[PDB]
Design a protein around this ligand. Structure first.
Ligand SMILES: NCCOB(c1ccccc1)c1ccccc1
Ligand SMILES: NCCOB(c1ccccc1)c1ccccc1
Ligand SMILES: C[C@@H]1NC(=O)N[C@@H]1CCCCCC(=O)O
Ligand SMILES: C[C@@H]1NC(=O)N[C@@H]1CCCCCC(=O)O
Ligand SMILES: [Ca+2]
Lengths: 596, 596
């Protein structure tokens, strides 16, 4: 394991500190023990420890400016020494002094001429979940994350480049977005901005991440509202103040779907960050998408819904009327219990009333490949993998067609439950019953699978037990379960109280039926009542707000995909462009509000 | 009764105080009445009261230093006098002065040369639930429990032994753990430690209780978090401080399963203390068992689960296919209503397809005695008394086998509902549906038995009433209940709405059926609705946290038993031992955290 390797190496490091009297005197800050170990007896001052550290590195882990200065006066070359381990590859003595905010040592290390651009590419300095913090690689990134504004400027004064990026291409601004202390990071964020070039171009706030993210755009996908609101002040214009009213004009550039995929809107939808959903409730974004859905969002959705409901109600019209035959097969040849009148007609005759059937089938088959075409190239959708697999079923039904298989029904019967139950996805948005469907959507594809095993397991015993009892009995009277699958099915219906239970009084029931079914009834009811109380965890207030906050996000989810895949002839661009206006050729939204 | 004996003796004591003018003057602190009762008229100064108390004992129950000093100047032998009753056997006048924190009297009693090692073995000083407090037996234990630090040192200054134990072998540290004022007891706990011998061995914090508990270990089983966190500071090492990070190295000695049963982990599981469950959420213990379950805990659990599900699905495979016969018995000899084709085959023939059946039966019979073997030698388990009794049933089925009883089915049919429903115990841990199973586990074995009587009682009337009505009627048409057990069963199903009710319209029903069943339906529904509202007591927030805190404890419950009964070849010891490291040969866990 990797988690224990750093546990062992930390214990292994403390051994070498205790064994080496130099590293011990540099940990314990034993000043008089350093002179007797360097001036009188010439000990190895370049003594590398278990982590590739030096005596000065240990003199810095524990703030010991006295031991650090003795090690820097008798060996000034220790200042340039980086750690040479796998976990701490590249960390210098300045990194340790900046993290500990030892301003006296950082200023005394910078007087010794320490490197202000030493990358710390150790495996413990990575942006991984197993690492508690992530400050970056440069000594300037460390000063900015610890909030030590004195060291931030003290490092800039010695030639610190704010443009510097780490192995992930993150500037000193991208890292500040990924910090807990957000209220203090905005102050530090402005401190780093005051050292920019000053010109309007090649600014630091525009350097893109290696995954295509500016510091403004990274704050949106990550869900940093304190940095989102702070970075929004730099890109919004206040038109006028008229008493309480103040019509502010937001920039709207990286916020709208201007680029093919660099847009911030396209990032909030497709991200795994649960917290990023709260960005769209900010005032530059909420009234934007509010205007995107009321008009040109909801109508085109319903058209796609009315077409779909019309398409499915015509596809089902082709099912209720299918070929027919009074069973060309001879008699009940297999078993006497056979109720079959096989409906197989291979000939394309019956020309009167069958010509209309080909129209619906052609519509159903071109309307299905169209669904494949638009989907040839989960947050708020699930239901529409079902439509894609449905059109696969009508194609398999088409393969089952013109071959006249016995199972012409099975993919067809599959097809229309999916197609109608898919209409339920249109209830999203529309009205309040959308939040009801997504509670279902969360429950169907979420805990139904994991909960059914528990029921299947409890059903397993009682269902199989019943089969043992009635295997003796003649199934003519009370043949509720005569086969093993029939034993599990009749008990499955009995677990949901959709069957009256084995109730035969003309005969006498076996001894173990009344004992098992009494236990089964009581167990099956206690399973359902504790299940309802288990649903009360999603009942207090936040969950009613959580099912509503992700529904309104599920609507914005469906809204932006339409715009990307609908033609731009319809659906004009949001805002009023900055050309033919005293603006900078941007698009910009007018938003007026009132205060108290 | 014993509770009234101390009520009578307290009233009996006040009688002797009022009757005896000395004890009255020592209660009322009547100074001038003591001189006229001792110096002028020689009264019995050794006058024993109803509780074996002296005049000085009464002069101390009510802080009366004036009356105490007159009784100690005219009779200094009263200082050594203990109480000679059954309730207060051994209590001296110093105990009363220490409890009342009369520092002036304790210092004046210690000047008189009072005993600082007088055991108070009275029945009221016992650690029993009927006694409100429990401070111990020694006068030093009393000073430490009342927090009077002045008297604690004032008693030590006169030769008080901190090592002293009471009749339960509890030191002055073990008693401080069992106190309400925890925030003030830690200060007193350190005060008692500063008087130790100073050497690292034979310390007071290591003296074991008479039930094998050190003061550190007693705080865990009792659930004293304030003393657990306080006693943990003495056994955790801080490796380094790197800005926000601080990797502390906990001792991990009495916390891990080092001993056969002296471990603290093995005590939190098997204890009745409901509050001790919160110890495992403390930082030296929570991340410990978190690493014990994710690896080497959960996989071995599922292997035991996959084997069990495979073992049971093979045992049930032996049931669905059993011996067969088209009923060697003649006809429906007893009653015409008989649907029997008895399946009894005594011969071990049918060699083709029966040889495989013996393999499953042999597996099912060796897999059952194996279950007995591992269990030949309740918190978080219940479900697995069921597995033990199941393997008893397959043995009784084996006894029923090779004897060819009519009831070859009954223990077999019993066996497989238990065996499958036992799989539900594997849902513990695994995922979130574990908390659902334990809510069932609490409900099945908790209130189901006590609630059923109420239903059986309400069923009793309506079920028996129905039998009276339909005893007249010919049971051929609407014979829902023709027998007395059949009367209770059809009504039992009717109480859970698993039967359509006596619905026959070709005939005319008796007068009292429609009147009773209408009352039965309304009563049966009001029974179920008030039952669902009765489940809302376990719905507000703490219960959802309580069903979750004991589930996560139910997982740790199952985890430690595996380690004790699984071979040590697999499952390495937690931590990294202190040999080949600058440590004290302990094992120790590295735990790094971040602050704000
Ligand atoms: N492309 C798969 C369909 O999923 B739907 C969807 C896609 C992305 C985000 C949210 C929902 C959908 C798309 C258009 C109209 C209605 C629903
Ligand atoms: N020994 C009786 C079985 O009870 B189980 C159990 C025992 C102690 C604590 C918690 C649960 C159990 C043991 C091992 C695996 C699965 C469950
Ligand atoms: C062991 C290393 N040697 C040292 O002198 N400091 C390091 C320890 C503290 C740095 C930990 C950084 C982290 O955990 O992210
Ligand atoms: C009655 C006894 N006689 C006395 O002088 N004090 C006792 C009464 C108070 C002690 C009660 C201790 C307890 O209840 O635990
Ligand atoms: Ca019915």
């Amino acid at each position: 394991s990797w988690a224990q390797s750093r546990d062992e190496q930390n214990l292994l490091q403390q051994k070498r500190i205790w064994e080496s009297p130099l590293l011990l005197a540099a940990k314990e800050n034993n000043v008089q023990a350093l002179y007797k170990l360097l001036k009188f007896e010439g000990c190895e001052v370049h003594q590398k420890g278990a982590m590739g550290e030096t005596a000065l590195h240990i003199a810095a882990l524990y703030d010991n400016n006295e031991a650090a200065q003795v090690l820097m006066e008798a060996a000034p070359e220790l200042v340039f020494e980086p750690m040479t381990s796998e976990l701490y590859e590249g960390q210098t003595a300045l990194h340790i002094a900046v993290i500990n905010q030892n301003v006296n040592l950082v200023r005394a290390l910078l007087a010794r001429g320490a490197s202000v651009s030493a990358r710390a590419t150790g495996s413990v300095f990575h942006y991984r979940p197993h690492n508690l913090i992530y400050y970056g690689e440069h000594p300037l990134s460390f000063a900015a994350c610890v909030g030590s504004e004195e060291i931030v400027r003290l490092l800039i004064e010695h030639g610190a480049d704010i443009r510097a990026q780490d192995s992930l291409g993150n500037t000193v601004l991208h890292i500040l977005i990924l910090q807990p202390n957000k209220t203090f990071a905005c102050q530090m964020y402005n401190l780093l901005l005051s050292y920019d070039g000053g010109d309007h171009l090649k600014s630091l706030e525009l350097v893109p991440n290696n995954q295509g993210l500016t510091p403004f755009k990274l704050a949106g996908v990550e869900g940093n509202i304190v940095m989102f609101q702070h970075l929004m002040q730099k890109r919004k214009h206040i038109q006028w103040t008229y008493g309480p009213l103040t019509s502010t004009l937001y920039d709207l550039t990286e916020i709208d779907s201007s680029g093919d995929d660099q847009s911030l809107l396209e990032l909030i939808v497709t991200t795994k960050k649960r917290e990023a959903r709260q960005i769209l409730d900010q005032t530059p974004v909420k009234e934007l998408v509010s205007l995107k859905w009321k008009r040109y969002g909801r109508p085109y959705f319903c058209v796609l819904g009315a077409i779909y409901v019309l398409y499915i109600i015509c596809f089902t019209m082709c099912c209720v009327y299918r070929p027919l035959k009074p069973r060309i097969t001879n008699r009940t040849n297999p078993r006497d219990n056979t109720l079959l009148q096989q409906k197989l007609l291979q000939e394309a005759y019956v020309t009167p009333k069958d010509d209309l059937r080909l129209v619906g089938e052609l519509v159903s088959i071109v309307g299905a490949v169209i669904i494949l075409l638009v989907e040839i190239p989960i947050l708020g959708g699930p239901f529409h993998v079902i439509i894609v697999t449905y059109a696969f079923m009508v194609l398999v039904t088409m393969v089952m067609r013109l071959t006249n298989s016995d199972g012409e029904v099975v993919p067809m019967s599959f097809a229309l439950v999916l197609g109608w139950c898919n209409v339920m996805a249109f209830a999203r948005g529309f009205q309040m019953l959308g939040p009801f469907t997504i509670m279902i959507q969360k429950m169907i594809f979420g805990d139904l699978m994991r909960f059914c095993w528990l029921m299947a397991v409890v059903i397993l015993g009682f269902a199989s037990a019943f089969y043992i009892i009635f295997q003796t009995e003649d199934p003519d009277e009370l043949g509720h379960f005569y086969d093993y699958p029939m034993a599990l099915f009749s008990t499955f219906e009995l677990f949901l109280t959709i069957i009256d239970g084995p109730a035969n009084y003309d005969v006498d029931l076996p001894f173990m039926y009344s004992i098992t079914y009494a236990a089964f009834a009581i167990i099956a009811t206690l399973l359902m009542l504790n299940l309802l109380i288990a649903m009360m965890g999603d009942t207090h207030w936040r969950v009613a707000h959580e099912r509503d906050e992700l529904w309104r996000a599920q609507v914005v989810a469906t809204t932006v995909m339409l715009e990307r895949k609908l033609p731009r002839c319809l659906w004009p661009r949001s805002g009023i462009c900055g050309r033919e206006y005293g603006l900078g050729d941007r698009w910009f939204l007018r938003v007026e509000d009132r205060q108290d």
